[PDB]
UniProtKB/TrEMBL annotation, chains A, B, C, D, E:
CDD domains: LGIC_AChBP. It comes from Aplysia californica (California sea hare). Keywords: Calcium, Metal-binding, Receptor, Signal. This is Soluble acetylcholine receptor. PANTHER family: NEUROTRANSMITTER GATED ION CHANNEL. GO terms for cellular component: membrane. Mg(2+) 6 binds at residue 185. Residues 16-203 form the Neurotransmitter-gated ion-channel ligand-binding domain.
Length: 205, 205, 205, 205, 205
């Protein structure tokens, strides 16, 4: 405990806080989804409700330490309030995201961070035809709200959404689920913004 | 990071906070809407629910810096809590506005600020006739709750609401959408208050 | 800005906070309502939902300044958290009040304050007969929860509720709307408590 | 104001906070209910919703003062955050309690405190038969969640719930309403826990 | 009170906060459930709502004291904010958990802690067949969100859920209710995570 207390104190009390990524020092965030449930479909508003875990990974030089100086500690858990976290946002939500998991991340000695918030999201999707064999397809993009591709880039480790925790007695069965990097351009703004597009194809069970 | 950390520290730790606009030093806020979805209509309460992005722009001398003194930094992202933001409020809401995007703004070296909150709003609107060819028209005014025209003025860059991110499979298609500056007077209060009136004409798709 | 920054600092950093009104130094609060909408009626729970602005006015010696010492500033806007505000409470609500406007007040050099929160309120009201010509009458009292008449008194400027921003396409039209000072006595407590009784008579449009 | 400011400062800035009651220094809390409305009944979930005021009284030596030293002040109003309050909790709620009144208490020079929170509570109750002449009976216990009888005891001034503010046009009329001290024992825990059991018998009006 | 004030001050003001469990200093948390009500079932979303108390127990060397040095005090109640608490999380919730009891724990002189939060939980469960003699079975896992088995292990005192406070007039009667330790492995992560699996079998009464 003494060694971890020292490490956290050296990292968090001494530092002026990380001011986010910049054009000179950009950052790549890795995203992965594990889809747990399609809870609800609303055909009168074209809203669909998902429950998933969003795995986020990034790496900061300012979170590095030498494990030899801190009793061989290679990593630790810490409150997400102690650190910067990326502003990854759904581009087509219809409600504030509801947070289902404790806001705690894992920091590793090389400065890498893993953060896995569980969320419930309502987003724009037309479920008409969900009761057929073909099913429906729906999509929602996730990216930084405020940082362009020149400050935050995204990648995935796989294009396959993790379906191994999908609720087996859901009202909806999943036919496929992909997560794919894209580049968007907007009327408001000159620079490209990066997203990962979660595409889910499903039907009634 | 070092240069941005310095800049933020020089702007935000040293300063007593900006105390808002005054009659002697008034401010013009530019507003623009991009309408994403008419999610829901309630014909038993005459409430309609929109999802949009509200682009806000203003400029303060106290947020100026010389980029040459801070490693050629011309702009940065920062939490909206670090700065003053205008109290732009819908005049006919029926619920607290729900915030859908991170509360982060962009500050530029000339002291100009851009802030683009995504919101879901329930407001007063009679949807009777939405299922016809003619459709319905509805309106909501946005302005400072507490500052008159002598402290906060508003303008738009265009009278055309941006419909280029409008959800193509919404239950409602948009026939027109305008945003127009107006001047209001109230029994309580001697001075004029400025608003931008969002007028949306729509029908079932 | 320099002069207002000084004024706010002199008023709020130097002061120990106002400890509320007392028997020795009582306060009169002026209340006025402007009724915007009867949004909803629930005949299975006898709850009705209003949207209104509640104009509050009072005066404290501790908020006085000489405008000559602060660049001729006669008034300013400030966050309601910076100052004491009266605990005016609906006596027959069925839900927490929802706040629809920014919590910002106007302080004037003589120590007078104006604060105008927009609220949505669910309160106890039997709507049976609302669909008739006679309509229904409902009532809700507003007063200090904790201060008697010997510490907080109330008055109105008029007994007529302001109907000039009433939503013209509401489901309910207003037949009359009054706001009247009353004195209540309770088993628990020896002293009188003051309220303003909002009486609204309405029917389907 | 000067004298009250001094008193509050002497009581709250100088003190280390009261650490709650103990076996060596136990406390008796007096409870009384005034029932305002049975708002809603849900026969598909067996939940019933009440609105009431819960009068709480207790006394601490650490809140004593000599009125002669503070300009003859015998009592004052203060925010409930300034002081310890008992953790009185409904034992069979189905939702977090909703608070309907300002969190402000009255402290008197002998160290006694009065606190009267207005609440809306959903609790476990089977309303089947509410539409008959006999009506239904329902019950909910209120006590400390964490303190046994050896640290917190309870009493009532009367076994009769105060029905003098009961909403006359409620959907439900009250046949009887009692509040009675009881002693409970639990598998988890060796000591007795005290409650006041609110028993309400009611039917459709 | 003097003695307890000293103890709390010595434990909480002097200490740098416990930084959670580690591989070098792991922790075992004991969990037990007492099921109070199955409130609601939603067959269109496959969500079920429970109300229960979750008894949590663990032990830290840094919370030890010698009762002889503090007036023979063997234990005390304190706010949960004063101490570390395990991040025990439902793995298949569909909404944020609603907290129904005060966030206060009991600390004992040997460093052991007891914490018993009452919760309402919506979780993934197919109620189809609940209206039959056989009923339905549903399950939800509870464990650390972020700590593996090498930092947080779990155990139960019994595999039998405590049904002695189960609401006798619930819509649903309980046929069986068990709580059983398990070990999970996830695609994201190399180490095992421990849970207690709450299995409830029930039907309409
Ligand atoms: C219309 C664009 C979509 C969304 C908006 C928010 N936004 C942007 C740039 C800078 C700051 C900012 O808040 C753009 C990119 N964002 C992902 C716009
Ligand atoms: C009834 C008026 C509309 C709305 C209200 C709130 N308000 C005002 C002035 C100063 C402070 C203030 O809170 C007025 C202007 N506002 C836009 C009134
Ligand atoms: C039953 C009374 C109604 C309401 C309650 C709250 N209250 C009071 C006195 C002191 C403090 C206080 O909280 C009384 C006056 N208030 C307006 C009681
Ligand atoms: C199952 C029991 C009912 C409730 C629970 C919470 N509780 C207790 C003791 C100490 C701390 C504590 O949180 C007991 C008494 N409480 C009123 C248990
Ligand atoms: C998909 C896994 C389930 C859940 C998630 C959250 N989580 C984990 C490890 C480290 C940090 C973290 O936040 C894993 C274990 N947890 C119980 C994943
Ligand atoms: C800033 O601008 C000049 C001119 O382009 C450049 O050569 C210089 O190296 C820059 N300074 C820093 C610290 O990046
Ligand atoms: C306070 O005490 C008594 C109360 O009757 C009174 O005679 C005296 O005038 C009061 N004095 C002050 C300074 O308040
Ligand atoms: C504590 O216990 C001892 C006996 O074990 C006793 O002598 C002492 O008086 C006790 N503490 C008190 C009275 O505070």
């Amino acid at each position: 405990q003494a060694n971890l207390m020292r490490l956290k104190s050296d990292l968090f009390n001494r530092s002026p806080m990380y001011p986010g990524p910049t054009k000179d020092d950009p950052l790549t965030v890795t995203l992965g989804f594990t889809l747990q449930d399609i809870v609800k479909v609303d055909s009168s508003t074209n809203e669909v409700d998902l429950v998933y875990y969003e795995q986020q990974r990034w790496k900061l030089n300012s979170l590095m330490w030498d494990p030899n100086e801190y009793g061989n500690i290679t990593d630790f858990r810490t409150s997400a309030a102690d650190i910067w976290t990326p502003d990854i946002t759904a581009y087509s939500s219809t409600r504030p995201v509801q947070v289902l998991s404790p806001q705690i991340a894992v920091v590793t000695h090389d400065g890498s961070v893993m953060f896995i918030p569980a969320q419930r999201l309502s987003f724009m999707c037309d479920p008409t035809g969900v009761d057929s064999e073909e099913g429906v397809t729906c999509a929602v993009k996730f990216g930084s709200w405020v940082y362009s591709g020149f400050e935050i880039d995204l990648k995935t480790d796989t294009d396959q959404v993790d379906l191994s925790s999908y609720y087996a007695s859901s009202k909806y069965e999943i036919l496929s689920a992909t997560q794919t990097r894209q580049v968007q351009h907007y009327s408001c703004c000159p620079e490209p913004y990066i997203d990962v597009n979660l595409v889910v194809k499903f039907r009634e069970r």
